[PDB]
Amino acid sequence: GVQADYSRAEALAAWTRLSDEFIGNCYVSVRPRHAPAWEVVVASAAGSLRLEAFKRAHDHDFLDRLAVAIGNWEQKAQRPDHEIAQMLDQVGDY
Amino acid sequence: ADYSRAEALAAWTRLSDEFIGNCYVSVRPRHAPAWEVVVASAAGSLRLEAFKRAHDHDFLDRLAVAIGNWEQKAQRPDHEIAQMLDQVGDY
Hints:
Two copies of one chain form a homodimer. Helices cover 65% and strands 0% of the residues of chain A. Chain A is mainly α. Chain A contains six helices and no strands. The longest helix of chain A has 14 residues, at 63-76. In chain A, 37% of the residues are buried. In chain A, α1 runs antiparallel to α4 and α2 crosses α5. Chain A is globular and about 35 Å long. The first copy, chain A, has one domain. Chains A and B meet through α2 and α5 of A and α2 and α5 of B. Chain B: This is Probable serine protease FE772_23065. Chain B: It comes from Lysobacter enzymogenes. Chain B: Belongs to the peptidase S1 family. Chain B: It is found in: Cell inner membrane.
């Protein structure tokens, strides 16, 4: 198998300016059934909550969809387009 | 063309326009119109318009999952969520 690489999850966690609440709302929308519910992630996060959520999204192959959701909300908050595109470039495909 | 699946999701969901719009913002791919574009374009039911665009741009399945996830948090019965997911199908 492939060893888990969380560098892309770490990059997204170090990029987004959304609140925990907006990140949670994105997660609830994009979460596939085989990924843990948001409350499970919240209860599990020893350190950074957003990092925990993005690690789970990596584990369950939906970090690309979660990154797109985060980018869409940042775009509505007038985050500059090239910064959204930089994030999307860094996070990649799942 | 045939919007049967978008129409069925429109009838099935009990979410508010606000929650549907929040789902749409999260799942919308770049080639699909932004939520504010959809709202501006809608002449009839807003949820129907959103779900027709999701059908057009091949993400109605992802939007249906988002809808089901919020319905689940509102205690919608599990089998009703699963019925909806079966009717929407794959994109």
